[PDB]
Amino acid sequence: MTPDDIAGFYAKRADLDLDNYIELDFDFECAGDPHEAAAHLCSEQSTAQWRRVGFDEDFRPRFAAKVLELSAEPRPSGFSVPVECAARGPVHACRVTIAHPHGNFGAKIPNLLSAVCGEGVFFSPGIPLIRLQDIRFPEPYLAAFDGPRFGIAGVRERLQAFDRPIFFGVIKPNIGLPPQPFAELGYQSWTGGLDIAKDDEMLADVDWCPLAERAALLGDACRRASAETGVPKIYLANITDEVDRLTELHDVAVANGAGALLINAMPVGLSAVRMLRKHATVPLIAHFPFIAAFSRLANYGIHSRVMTRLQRLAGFDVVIMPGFGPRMMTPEHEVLDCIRACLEPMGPIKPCLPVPGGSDSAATLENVYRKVGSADFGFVPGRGVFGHPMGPAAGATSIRQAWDAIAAGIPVPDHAASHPELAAALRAF
Amino acid sequence: MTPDDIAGFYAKRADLDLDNYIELDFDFECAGDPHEAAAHLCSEQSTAQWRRVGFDEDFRPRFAAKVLELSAEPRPSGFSVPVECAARGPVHACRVTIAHPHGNFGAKIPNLLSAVCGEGVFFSPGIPLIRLQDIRFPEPYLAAFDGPRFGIAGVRERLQAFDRPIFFGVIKPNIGLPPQPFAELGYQSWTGGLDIAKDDEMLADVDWCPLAERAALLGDACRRASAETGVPKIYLANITDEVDRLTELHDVAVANGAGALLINAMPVGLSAVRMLRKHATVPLIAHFPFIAAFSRLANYGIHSRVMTRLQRLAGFDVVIMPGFGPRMMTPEHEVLDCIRACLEPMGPIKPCLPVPGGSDSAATLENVYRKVGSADFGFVPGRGVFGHPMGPAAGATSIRQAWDAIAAGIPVPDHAASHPELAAALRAF
């Protein structure tokens, strides 16, 4: 890569059939020439070797990732965090858009990842810190996946929930409870006005609270509350387990009255999800364990937005992401980039429902709605429904009322002056 | 967690049946009391809520992760990297050992991860930066997995390779070559003295070089070279693909003479590997795309050693990790912690073979052997075999000779004075 091999790794937009390429945005820091560095980064990520021994061959035009656009400013301080490097001289901070020919891997999630962030990206020579900021896919490519089966669209219709956010609740306590008093809490929160009562991320099929039995009881409690309130209610059962057992658990949960399924997206593997999507009959919902390990630092890793794109692409109808509140340690606009990622038009792929976490209560709803900009989101209290002083039923109610205020454009604490549950929650949280 | 709920999340070694617990080592930074912080971290990771409404219940002793040991020193500077936080006052740097009751998830990889590094760990209140440094499992728990089928033990016997490192080679170029001139390069490198010729991480089943045909030709070239040298040779086929197609590709490759299979561990999902292990008939090898995104930074994420433990545990017989050389941007001792991780006695789980990456040639072999401490490792040149001036056959030879020197305790450049291939390689690299 030292000579004028560098030339063959750059291209103008105008010159490429952009339909054969996925666009990538990297921010990175490198030592020495930032032009060499970018080329090296395309090289490692794709060709790396374009001739054979002594052939004039160059299969760069058909197979090499190519720099579309590059931007680099000096930083005499050195790298952001201390690391250790294969180079000296100046250090630059860079922004690159690379066009990667997708014909290289075809339409499979595992192969995509291991190209756009395998060896190529992280062990490129002289580039210690690097962060993938976004992917863009062409229609032809997107057309190969199915994305969500339902989307916000579908989910809304299953709940008869229109022009208002979807109200989730994580039953608490979870870990430690046998299956019976579990249905109790769920039952109540639904009556109070919850749409969906969900299992905690860390609660699947275990000795002390088997899924077989949880779902049976919660399915009942669900059909019971649904009939008694006349509005459809939904039990969201966590079926996170070894990949082979995923299909088995889908059936067990659905047979027992589970309205939707929750999977821990990263731990099981996105490819796993895509396979369940082909078989699943109810909406699929992603939780966020693990994503944080590689998405938090601003100068390194992969932007959580990229994940969101992929989760949507893979088949999730709902994406639980980290939300607002300072207790969530994620930059404001970063969260919004994800909410955008979920809802953005994306070729034939349906928009999925974003669900910002954080310790939410009747008090924080007003805020989330302001910050989301519209009613197209989920809302997931834990305490604040099950933690409410008046009990779970009233905790749910408190949210419903908090909403009632916003939807009528009445500021919240005002409405709270005439509704005991909403007032209690404002006091408590 | 504000009151003396804190008490129930600490325990002395002496007090616990350590067999019910997995030990975890976290390094983190927190704001305000480090004692509250650690308790919160156990809480979030497990119980978080141990009563119901108004019951004296406390199911902390059976279900809550517990602080065995804690260590915390002040840092007036604030956090290492700039972040943003839910707290003020002093900032402390901490080291904790937490015992997590594994009865919480049972013996399943996805559930393990989503506890020991889901919400609990990364969104614990007032703890922005955190790194999982090590896991330790009890026999009872370990006994539930099978770990590697073959191990170094098995791999050594397949190759008749004893008392010397296993010599791998990544065929180059890869991306861009049709299947025919591929077999050519593989054939030669085996004849030169390579044990295993492998596909690049980024080369699976694609239009321009389908696995059906690669493996057919390379299987031939392998049987051919194996007969001609009288020593067993092996073709290592990459079968990275969508989870459901994994079983199909095992069969296609094995049927075609593939001696071992390579999977990209992270992109496919570790749960996926574990399922393949139940069905695979040849050794399994893990490559390292993606691990870097969450393991590089010293102050945040998950130490790659933890990954290695899990890969071994899942079923890999060989783990390709990032190696030495500065071009690899990983701390020396970190690489060694992984080499240790692979070989360490681990209950009924077999030791698997560690394979340090880096741009290795006949020149670096002497070094790796000194640094590994023994002959129990793989060695993976790319160029340096296929890049060698005299051609691939001679490139393989150069390594073989480099080894011959070491095994006789003759310093390398000395032996090179009488072997043209070793000399050329020393010049070239």
Swiss-Prot record, chains A, B:
The entry's keywords: Magnesium, Metal-binding
Binding residues annotated for Mg(2+), in chain numbering: K198, D200, E201
Pfam family, one: RuBisCO_large
Cofactor note: Binds 1 Mg(2+) ion per subunit.
Domain of life from the UniProt record: Bacteria
CC cofactor: Mg(2+)
Keyword Magnesium set for record: yes
GO terms of molecular function: magnesium ion binding; ribulose-bisphosphate carboxylase activity
N6-carboxylysine sites (modified residues): K198
UniProt GO BP: carbon fixation
Subunit details: Homodimer.
Family indicated by similarity: Belongs to the RuBisCO large chain family. Type IV subfamily.
Purpose: May be involved in sulfur metabolism and oxidative stress response. Does not show RuBisCO activity.
Name of protein: Ribulose bisphosphate carboxylase-like protein 2
